[PDB]
Amino acid sequence: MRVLVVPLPYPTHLMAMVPLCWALQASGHEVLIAAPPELQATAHGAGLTTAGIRGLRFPNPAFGQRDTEAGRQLWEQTASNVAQSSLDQLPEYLRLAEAWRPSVLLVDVCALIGRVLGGLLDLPVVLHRWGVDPTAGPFSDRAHELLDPVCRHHGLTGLPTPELILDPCPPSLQASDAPQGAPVQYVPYNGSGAFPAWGAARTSARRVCICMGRMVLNATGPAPLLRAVAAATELPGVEAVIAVPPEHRALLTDLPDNARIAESVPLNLFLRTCELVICAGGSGTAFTATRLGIPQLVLPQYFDQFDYARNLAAAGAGICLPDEQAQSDHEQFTDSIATVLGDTGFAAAAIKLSDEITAMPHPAALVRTLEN
Amino acid sequence: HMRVLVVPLPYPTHLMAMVPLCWALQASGHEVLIAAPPELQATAHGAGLTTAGILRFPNPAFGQRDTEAGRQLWEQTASNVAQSSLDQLPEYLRLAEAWRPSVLLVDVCALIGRVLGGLLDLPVVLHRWGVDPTAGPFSDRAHELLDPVCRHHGLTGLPTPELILDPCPPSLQASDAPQGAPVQYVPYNGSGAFPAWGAARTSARRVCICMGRMVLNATGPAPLLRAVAAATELPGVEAVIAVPPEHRALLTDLPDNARIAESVPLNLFLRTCELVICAGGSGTAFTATRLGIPQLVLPQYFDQFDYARNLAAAGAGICLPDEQAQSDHEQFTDSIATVLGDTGFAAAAIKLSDEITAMPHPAALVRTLENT
Ligand SMILES: OC[C@H]1O[C@H](O)[C@H](O)[C@@H](O)[C@@H]1O
Ligand SMILES: [Mg+2]
């Protein structure tokens, strides 16, 4: 196979596909990532090769509310944006496919250009979910409303149905309306970096990791990070491990002596020594914590994060702070950490979810499915 | 579920030779950590991997192990590596105790991994990067220096490894290398971008000149200047020059039939080339051989003379075996012309490519490792 990968332009979406890209190359197939400038570093940082492509609102709980007027509008608008940019850049992807001649397209569920390109080239399309998938309804309807015409002009019935949907989300966390996909085990890929000497052993302190993310914090500003540091550092006996992009290190003005800043250290190298992960939900951070059986305190902000956070809380594996009212309330935030630290039930439920993940077939096992 | 500690020599090409296997391991749900001194960090990280932190050329006597000069070179190599092993042992023992690997994947020359395996009673799977000339002088000196060490810790001597993995085409492997299990070479030549000029050949006879950092650091400009002069002077030829960024300044008054490739992984464009001129390092050469592309080989050191001689004996290339040949501008030019005029060279290289593709892929080896 010659697999052309068509991700959304968000590092976290491409990172979710990295172990599969490796599974393919290790099984003797060829892989190329169509990457806008925003994804180049992510792609190359994973050892992969690319074809260049030119390319107070938070928290917003309406993203987790597709039945409301605002929820439906946000997901329609997301579809409209990706549909418009798909048309704008279709000439570029058609040139690429002519140069490289993929036999199959591995396409993020939200990267609609990949479905168009599949239709127009008569290439099979394997969609890939990055995690919780809330695109049924508003997003998917709007994608068809906008792209069906375009495909019908090319002689198709409309935007085609994909060959297969790969799904790394444990079923217990998946949106109830996401159509059934093909399970694939989440393998944590959090980038390269070095094993911290401290990351090997537990401490007598209560180790609480805060891991927010470049893309979240650029959207939100520093509040979720700083409110998390204030909640974690207040409780007696806690050791905060603050996992940050290099540029966010300076927001950290005054930390207790035992706090650790972990700059560009892949979470998975140390997270088994932590009792709680405080995060915004849904990305590699959260799935690595769930893979490793670590409960989470989730402050959702946008997209699929409210869904992930609710679903995690419902499974008993963490707590959700659902909106600005909750996340701004230092008492609810600190009480939430104390709650998880004082009830081994959260870790038990997180272990159950870990078991859901590890019972799914690994990316190496999915390569045969792609073949077929 | 394995935890694999990878113990390479501090040379990037030897780590790159293991990268597809490392990715096969992580894609099948195992954990991998690369013990990396400073020299290897960026190669490891550039592959998406994680780390634990730790004259005169050409010299034909490397390919003359039945001579005194050849024995001394290989004995001095082993002496250097053995003393390093003793220097670094405390760090490796700390790391093993911290991270608790279940299996060591060790470069054939990284004697520390074998010491570590004996002392810790962990299985050692040795990994060849290609042609393995370590059987005479090298392996004897390694036993002379390290058997005592291992005897002080209660062992018979430096242990026999569990398994040797070998990606070298069997017809090219040194006759005295102990039997190793086949693993199919997967080209990995770093990350980078697919160049537009890499999609198709042109009317010209495209010759790639590809020499790595370690080789040019050792040799100086001479093998590069010699190849650029011989190639670009030949009627018909377009030279694609693939050298590390810091060696690009060596190329002045570049002719109009030369292109400097901008850090572009060989495998992205090599299928459009009719010849590769290289020093015989396994990543460049095995990528060429995998793709059925003949080579003109200017060996310099270590295993390069053996590969060069054996490739030529195969009909798949021409060897310039020493300085008098390599500096013979007429002979060099005539060698390029001879390959470009005789499709038998490419046909012989395809025979070798068939030995490679008969081997199981790295993904298939993960089971063998699981059983060890
Ligand atoms: O999937 C079912 C429920 O969860 C969703 O994610 C929606 O946003 C909400 O409209 C719905 O009531
Ligand atoms: Mg043999």
Side-chain angles (χ1 to χ4, degrees):
Chain A
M1 295 173 296
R2 294 172 73 72
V3 175
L4 184 71
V5 183
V6 182
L8 257 199
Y10 296 112
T12 203
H13 290 242
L14 176 54
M15 287 164 92
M17 288 184 305
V18 157
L20 191 59
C21 288
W22 295 334
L24 290 163
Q25 292 195 330
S27 287
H29 303 284
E30 280 173 293
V31 172
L32 187 64
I33 311 312
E38 308 99 289
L39 287 192
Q40 190 193 56
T42 294
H44 297 168
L48 303 166
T49 53
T50 57
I53 294 303
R54 288 191 311 163
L56 312 101
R57 260 143 7 127
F58 307 106
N60 195 348
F63 279 103
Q65 303 166 343
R66 282 177 281 144
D67 61 288
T68 60
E69 176 179 47
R72 175 177 160 185
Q73 294 167 156
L74 295 162
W75 284 100
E76 294 188 353
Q77 158 86 178
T78 310
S80 294
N81 295 342
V82 175
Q84 182 57 67
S85 76
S86 302
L87 263 18
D88 285 347
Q89 96 213 142
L90 175 60
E92 231 175 313
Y93 283 75
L94 280 166
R95 288 192 253 101
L96 183 50
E98 182 55 43
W100 200 74
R101 309 306 242 273
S103 70
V104 65
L105 304 177
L106 174 73
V107 177
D108 185 282
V109 169
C110 287
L112 299 174
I113 178 57
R115 295 180 62 196
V116 179
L117 194 76
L120 266 47
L121 296 177
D122 224 74
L123 294 179
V125 164
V126 172
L127 294 185
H128 187 91
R129 289 174 173 144
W130 63 87
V132 177
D133 174 9
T135 64
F139 184 99
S140 173
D141 288 351
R142 181 67 171 172
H144 280 288
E145 161 176 37
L146 291 181
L147 298 176
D148 279 346
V150 180
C151 295
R152 283 170 187 147
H153 180 66
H154 286 270
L156 306 184
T157 53
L159 192 72
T161 303
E163 272 299 298
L164 175 74
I165 302 170
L166 306 175
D167 191 351
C169 189
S172 264
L173 301 183
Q174 187 49 276
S176 57
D177 65 357
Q180 176 65 56
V184 63
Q185 185 181 305
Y186 180 71
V187 164
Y189 174 68
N190 317 128
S192 61
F195 176 64
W198 55 263
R202 322 169 141 160
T203 177
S204 43
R206 315 301 300 282
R207 189 170 283 161
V208 172
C209 179
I210 298 165
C211 185
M212 281 310 144
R214 163 181 292 148
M215 293 231 329
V216 166
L217 293 167
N218 287 356
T220 59
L225 175 58
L226 298 174
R227 290 170 171 188
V229 168
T233 60
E234 176 160 292
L235 291 173
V238 164
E239 171 175 313
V241 179
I242 299 162
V244 264
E247 67 266 27
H248 297 149
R249 188 186 192 116
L251 313 165
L252 305 168
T253 46
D254 173 24
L255 289 177
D257 275 336
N258 77 329
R260 298 174 191 273
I261 300 172
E263 185 183 315
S264 329
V265 176
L267 211 66
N268 72 266
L269 299 173
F270 63 84
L271 204 57
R272 292 171 186 76
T273 71
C274 300
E275 292 183 68
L276 176 69
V277 185
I278 302 170
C279 66
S283 79
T285 294
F287 272 33
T288 289
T290 304
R291 172 61 185 83
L292 292 171
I294 309 301
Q296 304 133 57
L297 171 53
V298 190
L299 292 77
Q301 305 295 321
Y302 51 61
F303 202 59
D304 59 344
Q305 294 172 344
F306 297 95
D307 283 288
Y308 179 85
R310 285 205 294 270
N311 291 1
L312 189 74
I319 290 182
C320 174
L321 298 176
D323 47 29
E324 171 72 351
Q325 289 146 214
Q327 289 175 23
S328 73
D329 184 340
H330 182 71
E331 297 300 309
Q332 292 182 51
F333 206 146
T334 68
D335 286 351
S336 290
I337 298 179
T339 290
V340 173
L341 292 181
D343 176 359
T344 59
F346 290 96
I351 289 296
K352 287 232 314 190
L353 288 175
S354 182
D355 293 347
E356 275 179 55
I357 290 167
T358 56
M360 305 164 46
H362 47 56
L366 271 290
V367 182
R368 171 71 99 261
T369 305
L370 288 220
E371 280 167 12
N372 302 347
Chain B
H1 185 261
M2 297 183 282
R3 270 197 303 284
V4 184
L5 184 58
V6 178
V7 183
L9 264 190
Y11 304 107
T13 63
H14 292 222
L15 173 55
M16 280 164 90
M18 297 199 286
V19 155
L21 185 55
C22 285
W23 279 340
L25 284 161
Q26 291 194 341
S28 59
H30 309 289
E31 280 175 277
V32 167
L33 184 63
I34 309 298
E39 289 84 11
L40 277 193
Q41 191 184 54
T43 299
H45 298 170
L49 300 168
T50 59
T51 61
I54 297 302
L55 225 24
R56 252 58 140 21
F57 292 97
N59 191 342
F62 285 101
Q64 301 169 339
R65 279 178 297 130
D66 304 321
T67 72
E68 152 82 25
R71 295 196 203 294
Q72 276 190 158
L73 283 171
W74 287 99
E75 293 173 332
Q76 148 219 323
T77 302
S79 288
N80 299 348
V81 181
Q83 186 56 238
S84 290
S85 301
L86 292 174
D87 292 352
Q88 295 172 336
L89 198 40
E91 281 166 280
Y92 284 78
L93 289 167
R94 277 155 37 213
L95 173 54
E97 178 73 313
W99 196 72
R100 299 207 173 297
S102 57
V103 58
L104 309 179
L105 178 60
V106 176
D107 172 336
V108 161
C109 291
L111 302 172
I112 179 60
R114 295 177 71 184
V115 173
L116 191 60
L119 269 55
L120 293 180
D121 194 25
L122 301 160
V124 168
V125 173
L126 281 195
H127 195 279
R128 286 172 172 148
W129 67 84
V131 175
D132 178 356
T134 68
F138 177 100
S139 167
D140 278 355
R141 184 63 181 169
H143 275 293
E144 190 190 358
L145 299 172
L146 303 171
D147 284 349
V149 179
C150 282
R151 292 195 252 102
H152 293 132
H153 303 253
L155 315 183
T156 289
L158 192 65
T160 299
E162 236 54 59
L163 179 55
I164 301 171
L165 302 181
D166 189 352
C168 188
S171 65
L172 305 174
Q173 182 57 273
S175 56
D176 64 358
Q179 180 183 344
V183 60
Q184 191 172 322
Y185 178 70
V186 172
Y188 175 64
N189 324 119
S191 71
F194 173 71
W197 58 260
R201 68 163 289 175
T202 68
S203 49
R205 313 305 294 290
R206 185 166 290 172
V207 170
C208 173
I209 297 166
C210 184
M211 289 174 197
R213 181 169 276 141
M214 291 298 301
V215 178
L216 301 171
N217 283 355
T219 61
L224 186 58
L225 290 174
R226 285 155 181 167
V228 166
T232 57
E233 283 189 26
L234 195 63
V237 165
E238 181 173 296
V240 171
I241 296 154
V243 303
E246 76 280 4
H247 300 288
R248 287 175 201 165
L250 305 174
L251 299 172
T252 67
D253 294 352
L254 233 241
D256 343 14
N257 60 332
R259 168 187 292 276
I260 306 173
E262 275 292 301
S263 285
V264 176
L266 222 58
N267 76 261
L268 297 178
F269 66 86
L270 208 54
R271 289 173 186 78
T272 67
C273 293
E274 285 181 68
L275 174 66
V276 177
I277 294 163
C278 59
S282 67
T284 292
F286 283 10
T287 292
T289 291
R290 175 60 184 87
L291 292 179
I293 306 307
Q295 304 123 241
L296 207 184
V297 192
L298 297 62
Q300 307 298 141
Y301 58 32
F302 296 106
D303 55 316
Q304 297 169 344
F305 299 94
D306 289 283
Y307 176 78
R309 285 192 301 258
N310 294 354
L311 185 78
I318 285 173
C319 170
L320 313 179
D322 51 32
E323 195 194 38
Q324 68 79 39
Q326 298 171 16
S327 60
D328 188 334
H329 170 74
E330 178 182 83
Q331 169 179 347
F332 197 153
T333 294
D334 283 353
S335 290
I336 295 173
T338 285
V339 179
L340 298 176
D342 182 0
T343 58
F345 285 93
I350 290 286
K351 294 290 182 162
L352 294 171
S353 176
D354 295 348
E355 290 187 67
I356 294 173
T357 60
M359 295 194 218
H361 291 275
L365 271 291
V366 177
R367 166 68 74 58
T368 310
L369 295 189
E370 286 176 358
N371 295 346
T372 306

